[PDB]
Structure 1
Amino acid sequence: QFTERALTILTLAQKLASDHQHPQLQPIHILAAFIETPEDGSVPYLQNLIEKGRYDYDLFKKVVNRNLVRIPQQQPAPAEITPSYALGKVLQDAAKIQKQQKDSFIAQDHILFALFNDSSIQQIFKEAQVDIEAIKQQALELRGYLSKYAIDMTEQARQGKLDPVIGREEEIRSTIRVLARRIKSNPCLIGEPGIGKTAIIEGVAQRIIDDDVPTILQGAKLFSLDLAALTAGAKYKGDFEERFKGVLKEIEESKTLIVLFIDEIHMLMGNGKDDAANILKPALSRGQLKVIGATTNNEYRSIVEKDGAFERRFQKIEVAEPSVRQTVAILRGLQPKYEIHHGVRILDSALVTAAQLAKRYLPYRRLPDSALDLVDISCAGVAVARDSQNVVDSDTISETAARLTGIPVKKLSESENEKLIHMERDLSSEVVGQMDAIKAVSNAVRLSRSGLANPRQPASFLFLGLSGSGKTELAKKVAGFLFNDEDMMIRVDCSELSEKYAVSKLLGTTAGYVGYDEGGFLTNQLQYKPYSVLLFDEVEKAHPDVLTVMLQMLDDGRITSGQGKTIDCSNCIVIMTSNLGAEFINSQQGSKIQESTKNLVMGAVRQHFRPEFLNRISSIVIFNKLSRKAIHKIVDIRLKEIEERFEQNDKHYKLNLTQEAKDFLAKYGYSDDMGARPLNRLIQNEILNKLALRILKNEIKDKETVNVVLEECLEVLPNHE
């Protein structure tokens, strides 16, 4: 109800009546409280609403002292009988004043006002008007000041607005050590955004709230300064100093250990300096004016480069991210806040896994926030879904994260079935033979899905064999099964090389040079798409400088960029290709991959491909030769897909191909030295060419047949009508 100051003045009125041996309390006794002390700082006595308003404080002093002498000496027992209606009314009026003034507590000024409004000198010896406006003016110009300049974190903390923080006790102590300096009063927190800089300032506030602060700072209070009053609050040229200088001086003395702080101190460098608030502050740094700032490391760098002065006042305080275990500790401290915020229970394992998840899948975010996001997001997820529950650790988190960050890998299937149990079948259905390539694909994904693959390495395989054997097709089909979308594959022509390639590859352009589109094909796409299948079109012909660079993705997945940042791959499957082995494939020694032969190939590949790459690669995969037996399946597969891809079914075929057509293809388009690719030449050269002509001649109205000639031919529906 009352401020401590208001209570003091009222209390003094009461106790002065006791000390002066006076019966019922009168307006006189509150006036006695007003003149209770010689201290000029006491507004009720010298730096008064009277003295700086309209009348000599002595006039009033003598009104009161005359009256105090005039009231007769009583037995101590009644010395302060009651406030009666007289002081009751003054206090009630002080409350009416609060309502008029919109003041949350009764001020000593409300007591000064209310008393003065009711009061009049009781005797002819002194006269003075109750100059209400003068006393209000003087009251308004005193004490109330920071609500116009900075947000009072400490009182708001007393009011429960503070978020307590843990695990930063040294960082908090560091700000204390700096704040405890006698000369260099200015600390600043420097680090990554999301590192916990504001959190540390609030940590200081927590230290203040629990009064765990050294005498120099023991009475401290924190206030959030800048942008509003320092920028929005400006229309005139001197507005960088009006209000700003004002508050700097308002807080230098008496009013406890006021410490302002800046959360976004980046501004305080000035756009071209020009003392845009920025210089006046350090200009006054020889004393008081204790302020703590906060900036990111790069913003720090920028304000340093753009100023050269605040840095002589401000102590650089480095803030490091916590370890995963430490992150969990803060998560635990924060856990109940989240359970409350969302009305859901959270498992300790939720917190544990959130933190390690973040380390694994959120490289662009710091652990404090990243882990918290996984928690607060999961909780929010449930809060929305709550119309139905609680948060369940990795269950909720893996799904939640995958939904936002990508990586469905962690969701686990409703049924593993086609999801890597029967996948070898499904892959063998799309492509024929080459089961080891198929197994490699499945295994790559299975290890990823199971959390077993070495996390530092993307699945990586190099595919050897004769072009036309399905090496690209495999990669595309992998994307097919990986995303249920074959166009999500990333494919780079790795053979387009000379040394002049930086940006075309993950290296990017370099900032400071023309062009700021970097590694678009790889770096930008990788940043955007957390995983894919990356196909390198004949690494056999790629320049070795690039291959050496690609190695970095191949293993130890970290990826740099000319932007000064990194990408850091993880879950992208990479596929490299070569036909070196064609020199051995053309031996035609069985459809199966032969021992020794395949080794001569891989040996030669190393000779013509840095083994350093191959010494990191998950494995080299070799394709089976497409024997006619393989063809006997492939032809149907391809004719089916080829037809299905032909726009819409306004015609298409009945396809009475039977063995006769199949064999023709196996006897005519079947080049032992070019895989199935020449069968496609046959198919288009014969089947589609005739078809196109029949369509062109409008000899087909709907459907179509394939009729073996002894070659192939088509039928006529309308007779060239």
Structure 2
Amino acid sequence: EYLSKYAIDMTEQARQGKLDPVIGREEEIRSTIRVLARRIKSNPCLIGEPGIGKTAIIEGVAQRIIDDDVPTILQGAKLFSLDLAALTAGAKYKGDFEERFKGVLKEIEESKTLIVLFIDEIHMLMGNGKDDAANILKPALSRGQLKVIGATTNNEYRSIVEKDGAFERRFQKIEVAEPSVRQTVAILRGLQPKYEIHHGVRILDSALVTAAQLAKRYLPYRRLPDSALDLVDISCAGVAVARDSKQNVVDSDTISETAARLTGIPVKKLSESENEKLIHMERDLSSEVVGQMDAIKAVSNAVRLSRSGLANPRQPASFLFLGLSGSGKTELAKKVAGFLFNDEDMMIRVDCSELSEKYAVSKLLGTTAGYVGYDEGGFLTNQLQYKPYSVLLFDEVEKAHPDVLTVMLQMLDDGRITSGQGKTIDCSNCIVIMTSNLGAEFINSQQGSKIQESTKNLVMGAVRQHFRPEFLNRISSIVIFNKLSRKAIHKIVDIRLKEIEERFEQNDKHYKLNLTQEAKDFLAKYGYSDDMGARPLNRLIQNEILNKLALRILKNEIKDKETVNVVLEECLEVLPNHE
């Protein structure tokens, strides 16, 4: 009895209740049975994506046999799970491998009904370099029924066929479908009591619905038969785990939140406060970014719509930031990341500055097999696969060539971006911020700091000339940043001076910032090179304050703190001595 040494009796497991029942797989089960009922091509092969119920069908078959839903032709058969030890038990002694398959392949038909062998992984047969590694026994003996049911991944099936040939001719390929959310939930309900019992917790029916629905939206890398269960089982454990540390599974408070802990996606944490998530966002973005209030609100509102998943399931929040350079076109984006991930550096910067249609897509998505270097995904695939709700920044997306813009067309509408590898990303939960300098030709007229209607249209003209409308039509909003009125500049100077303090590592020397209104005006007035935005303020500070400070530091004329005054644009502010 080789089978009693090397294999599991699947009908034993069925009779003992060790296998889960299956729902909705009845036709696929019938297909495997109908194939077994054949005299030729009697060996079905369950083919599908990993996790697509392939052995669920098999486990289901075992139950259908003991329950007599199988033609008597086949019902009288016994089912065994083989391979692995069946081979590896031997090692030394050439040919033992054949001896191991041989009595299995004899006992399988020796009076004690017909035994169907299960090779859950057909693809692991054939032979590693062929080596006549007992695989030849199968075709050789295959005429004598010896029925075998097996399974393989779609990808693996391809490999099986190409590697052996005879297997394609001997097996009946069977596609196994991924269930819909509705079907998935039915599956979950069947298994619901197993989890409730296993964990000692209850599950809300809406929770099962949520798991399947939520998984379909936030676990694109895992097929539903598993993804939905992962949320159910993980959640049940979470309940039992907390309970039994030093109840039931709630659709919202348990599963929605569980999925978010697992996958990210803050909007599914169903947070208790849109004050400490949205309100503060506008305030703090406004606190640091002066002016461009319009943009801040545009982003905050676009972000607001993602709360609870209300925003479109296939469209990233998306923006195009136009406006005067020095207006915070990328600073806002950093501050948004600064809020979203509580850290500005978590933003995925995309170096759009360097683009050619011949490299432009490949550096983002990588390439296919056969090309020097695979490590696909430089900027997008490699990040989006790990960061589902990251925020992307395209610094001068306008320099993109149509091929990239095409990637962006997908990104911005059904963002199931296909990587060079051939696998999609599905980044609909990300935030996409893009920038352009096209409006410079009109905003530099300086005729009003808040973008005027004439200016707006002229700018959008350029945008529409440059990008195809197809792109523009997929952007949540296009915002032209306001120019930095002198009003803004005074507020900004204070902010910048504080920023300088904040970034000054170990502030032994620290700024007293005795700016007084006079130096505030000095920096604000003389640094207000309106047509370059706020950026010149920095240059002014470096030129007038920091250089002198650094020198006094080098000369040790300052021990700590930092005196400030105005000595008298010719005053050059000029910081005082200290000690």
Q: TM-score, normalized by length of structure 2?
A: 0.96
1:358 Cα offset (Å): 0.8
Query: Is the Cα contact below 8 Å between 1:700 and 1:718 reproduced in 2?
Result: no
Alignment of 1:443-454 (within 5 A): 443-454=301-312
Query: Is the Cα contact below 8 Å between 1:493 and 1:537 reproduced in 2?
Result: yes
Change (3 A) 1:712 1:350: farther
Question: How many Å separate the matches in 1 of 2:153 and 2:577?
Answer: 79
The question of 1:697 aligning with 2:569 is answered: no
Which deviates the most, 439-448 or 475-484?
Answer: 439-448
Change (3 A) 1:713 1:347: farther
Query: Is the Cα contact below 8 Å between 1:321 and 1:366 reproduced in 2?
Result: yes
Greater C-alpha radius of gyration: 1
Query: Is the Cα contact below 8 Å between 1:698 and 1:720 reproduced in 2?
Result: no
Query: Is the Cα contact below 8 Å between 1:655 and 1:704 reproduced in 2?
Result: yes
Question: How many Å separate the matches in 2 of 1:393 and 1:720?
Answer: 64
Which deviates the most, 622-631 or 408-417?
Answer: 408-417
Per the alignment, in what secondary structure is the counterpart of residue 708 of structure 1? coil
Query: Is the Cα contact below 8 Å between 1:461 and 1:621 reproduced in 2?
Result: yes
Change (3 A) 1:505 1:455: farther
Query: Is the Cα contact below 8 Å between 1:707 and 1:714 reproduced in 2?
Result: no
1:260 Cα offset (Å): 1.2
Query: Is the Cα contact below 8 Å between 2:559 and 2:578 reproduced in 1?
Result: no
Unaligned runs of 5+ in 1: 1-144
Per the alignment, in what secondary structure is the counterpart of residue 60 of structure 2? helix
1:710 Cα offset (Å): 2.1
1:540 Cα offset (Å): 2.6
Deviation track 1:221-266 (CA, whole Å, cap 9, x = no partner) reads: 1100101112343322202211211111111131023111111211
Deviation track 1:651-684 (CA, whole Å, cap 9, x = no partner) reads: 1111111221111012211101100000100011
Change (3 A) 1:456 1:719: closer
Query: Is the Cα contact below 8 Å between 1:544 and 1:610 reproduced in 2?
Result: no
Query: Is the Cα contact below 8 Å between 1:704 and 1:714 reproduced in 2?
Result: no
Per the alignment, in what secondary structure is the counterpart of residue 241 of structure 1? helix
1:718 Cα offset (Å): 12
Query: Is the Cα contact below 8 Å between 2:545 and 2:575 reproduced in 1?
Result: no
Question: How many Å separate the matches in 2 of 1:231 and 1:443?
Answer: 61
Deviation track 1:385-431 (CA, whole Å, cap 9, x = no partner) reads: 01273211122112211111111221022322121134222221121
Q: TM-score, normalized by length of structure 1?
A: 0.78
Change (3 A) 1:590 1:717: closer
Unaligned runs of 5+ in 2: none
Which deviates the most, 309-318 or 319-328?
Answer: 309-318
Change (3 A) 1:720 1:435: closer
Question: How many Å separate the matches in 2 of 1:659 and 1:571?
Answer: 46
Question: How many Å separate the matches in 2 of 1:384 and 1:652?
Answer: 49
Change (3 A) 1:381 1:347: same
Change (3 A) 1:606 1:631: same
127, 131, 147: which one aligns with 1:270: 127
Question: How many Å separate the matches in 2 of 1:719 and 1:194?
Answer: 73
Question: How many Å separate the matches in 1 of 2:505 and 2:108?
Answer: 77
Per the alignment, in what secondary structure is the counterpart of residue 562 of structure 2? coil
Question: How many Å separate the matches in 2 of 1:467 and 1:720?
Answer: 37
Question: How many Å separate the matches in 1 of 2:25 and 2:129?
Answer: 35
Which deviates the most, 417-426 or 396-405?
Answer: 417-426
Per the alignment, in what secondary structure is the counterpart of residue 412 of structure 1? coil
Alignment of 1:293-442 (within 5 A): 293-387=150-244, 389-442=247-300
Question: How many Å separate the matches in 1 of 2:521 and 2:575?
Answer: 26
Deviation track 1:670-706 (CA, whole Å, cap 9, x = no partner) reads: 1011000001000111110111011111011111121
Query: Is the Cα contact below 8 Å between 2:204 and 2:249 reproduced in 1?
Result: yes
Question: How many Å separate the matches in 2 of 1:430 and 1:532?
Answer: 21
Alignment of 1:108-257 (within 5 A): 145-257=2-114
Query: Is the Cα contact below 8 Å between 2:376 and 2:420 reproduced in 1?
Result: yes
Change (3 A) 1:167 1:656: same
Query: Is the Cα contact below 8 Å between 2:563 and 2:577 reproduced in 1?
Result: no
Which deviates the most, 400-409 or 374-383?
Answer: 400-409
1:711 Cα offset (Å): 6.3
Question: How many Å separate the matches in 1 of 2:40 and 2:204?
Answer: 48
The question of 1:708 aligning with 2:566 is answered: yes
The question of 1:638 aligning with 2:496 is answered: yes
**Higher RCO (C-alpha 8 Å, min separation 6):** 2
Percent of aligned pairs with the same amino acid: 100
1:451 Cα offset (Å): 1.6
Which deviates the most, 418-427 or 521-530?
Answer: 418-427
Change (3 A) 1:614 1:327: same
Query: Is the Cα contact below 8 Å between 1:178 and 1:185 reproduced in 2?
Result: yes
Deviation track 1:72-96 (CA, whole Å, cap 9, x = no partner) reads: xxxxxxxxxxxxxxxxxxxxxxxxx
1:719 Cα offset (Å): 8.2
Query: Is the Cα contact below 8 Å between 2:563 and 2:575 reproduced in 1?
Result: no
Query: Is the Cα contact below 8 Å between 1:707 and 1:713 reproduced in 2?
Result: no
Query: Is the Cα contact below 8 Å between 1:149 and 1:244 reproduced in 2?
Result: no
Query: Runs of 4 or more off by more than 4 Å in structure 1?
Result: 711-721
Query: Is the Cα contact below 8 Å between 1:705 and 1:715 reproduced in 2?
Result: no
Per the alignment, in what secondary structure is the counterpart of residue 203 of structure 2? coil
Deviation track 1:506-549 (CA, whole Å, cap 9, x = no partner) reads: 33122121111112211111111112111111123222332222
Question: How many Å separate the matches in 1 of 2:569 and 2:457?
Answer: 41
Deviation track 1:89-142 (CA, whole Å, cap 9, x = no partner) reads: xxxxxxxxxxxxxxxxxxxxxxxxxxxxxxxxxxxxxxxxxxxxxxxxxxxxxx
Question: How many Å separate the matches in 2 of 1:345 and 1:204?
Answer: 29
Question: How many Å separate the matches in 1 of 2:466 and 2:43?
Answer: 62
Query: Is the Cα contact below 8 Å between 2:516 and 2:565 reproduced in 1?
Result: no
Per the alignment, in what secondary structure is the counterpart of residue 292 of structure 1? strand
Query: Is the Cα contact below 8 Å between 1:504 and 1:521 reproduced in 2?
Result: no
Question: How many Å separate the matches in 2 of 1:502 and 1:238?
Answer: 55
What is the number of equivalent residue pairs in this alignment? 577
The question of 1:581 aligning with 2:433 is answered: no
Query: Is the Cα contact below 8 Å between 1:699 and 1:716 reproduced in 2?
Result: no
1:615 Cα offset (Å): 1.7
Which deviates the most, 415-424 or 696-705?
Answer: 415-424
Question: How many Å separate the matches in 2 of 1:413 and 1:183?
Answer: 60
Alignment of 1:538-577 (within 5 A): 538-577=396-435
Which deviates the most, 651-660 or 345-354?
Answer: 651-660
Per the alignment, in what secondary structure is the counterpart of residue 707 of structure 1? coil
Superposition CA RMSD, Å: 2.0
Deviation track 1:302-321 (CA, whole Å, cap 9, x = no partner) reads: 11111111221111011010
